[PDB]
Design a protein around this ligand. Structure first.
Ligand SMILES: Cc1cc2nc3c(=O)[nH]c(=O)nc-3n(C[C@H](O)[C@H](O)[C@H](O)COP(=O)(O)O)c2cc1C
Ligand SMILES: Cc1cc2nc3c(=O)[nH]c(=O)nc-3n(C[C@H](O)[C@H](O)[C@H](O)COP(=O)(O)O)c2cc1C
Lengths: 206, 204
């Protein structure tokens, strides 16, 4: 009963800071607090940073659209696409590290979305909109920002993620912000306290 | 000849010859000529340049580090080169169609090399000052629209902000919207774009 009842989590980390990654701490902190709240988690973890994912190009896009391409590295990248999508569809809760870099998410997070946001697989075209094919999936996006000191003049990261997740049917998405982390002298602390409070409220729902 | 504007043209579409943003960039440059502007282009097909992804060693290397590795010493030398082209330009023209609700990765990648402390922007007690002086920009962004899942435009504010970071405050867009709409949507957006082009060719 307990082991079958367990929720399945998919956990993407995109930071380039490695062991010092504040978004990676906070994911672990979030996941631990879910345990603390009586949730058993079955994690599939991807350090997208270390996977050397391919950029989306003309042939990869074609192949991914349904064409038989034979080149080895493309077929290898398509195999990875179908893998990441199987992993995603199987999962119950999606957790993503998305620190803001030059006002966008980091390249490796973007590349994940480029392989996974696929027609016929995670969405099908309608007369009007596209219909999302990922079902039973909620998201929790952990996002940090240094703020005004790093030129945070807008948050394009957030609505981008809401929209690219919504494309594939991931309609419910919660955010965990650590904002203003370069503000001297209490910025980091306050950001981290704010995120921990978001974590604590957010670890509960199941 | 010394009259001539210096344009920097960034192409990041993955559709090669069929690229609509590359078409509209070219139309935008044909019109500038039509209205008596002479231009000296530096042209980048970012798509074919296979640009390095920003990673930990490279970011450090860009942030004033000493790294003797070769692949990283080359990407820093490229960064410097893309930057020196930018700060030398008078007009920046960018191909930025919407792919999976973002810019194409290749464009992004250029921004991660060029948006760089002590080079294009510098730190301050509060906000960062830009160092790219005397540079307008023009952004060609074609979009499929509703059929391709455009629920909001994150591209626009993203671009104004990242360009703002390094001091490019003046930005105008060429939107070819709704291109997937049946049965005249592509023609209507192309037209729309064309009229936007007719207007923006004039300024100088
Ligand atoms: C390459 C790079 C670009 C960044 N760009 C921004 C930015 O545009 N706006 C901002 O507020 N913070 C920016 N930051 C600061 C990070 O968003 C912040 O330090 C965050 O905590 C990093 O989380 P991580 O440790 O999980 O990478 C940037 C950091 C790096 C390394
Ligand atoms: C990989 C890929 C992703 C796309 N994603 C979107 C999208 O998320 N929203 C949208 O409205 N249109 C989308 N489109 C449609 C393009 O924005 C549109 O066809 C564009 O005009 C093509 O420009 P180009 O020919 O310069 O690539 C996408 C096209 C491709 C090839």
């Amino acid at each position: 009963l307990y082991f079958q009842s367990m929720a399945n989590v998919l956990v993407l980390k995109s930071s380039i800071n490695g062991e010092t990654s504040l978004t990676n701490q906070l994911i672990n902190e979030f996941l631990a607090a879910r345990q603390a709240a009586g949730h058993g988690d079955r994690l599939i973890e991807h350090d997208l940073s270390a996977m050397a994912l391919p950029t989306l190009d003309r042939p990869l896009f074609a192949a991914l659209r349904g064409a038989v391409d034979p080149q080895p590295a493309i077929r290898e990248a398509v195999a990875l696409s179908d893998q990441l999508i199987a992993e995603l569809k199987a999962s119950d809760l999606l957790v993503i590290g998305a620190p803001m870099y030059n006002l966008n998410v980091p390249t490796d997070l973007k590349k994940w979305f480029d392989l996974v946001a696929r027609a016929r697989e995670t969405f099908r075209y309608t007369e009007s909109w596209p219909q999302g094919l990922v079902e039973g999936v909620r998201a929790v996006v952990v996002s940090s920002r240094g703020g005004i000191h790093q030129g945070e003049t807008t948050d394009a990261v957030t609505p981008y993620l809401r929209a690219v997740l919504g494309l594939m049917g991931i309609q419910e998405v919660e955010f965990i912000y650590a904002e203003g982390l370069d503000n001297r002298p209490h910025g980091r602390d306050a950001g981290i306290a704010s995120a921990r409070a978001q974590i604590a409220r957010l670890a509960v729902p199941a």
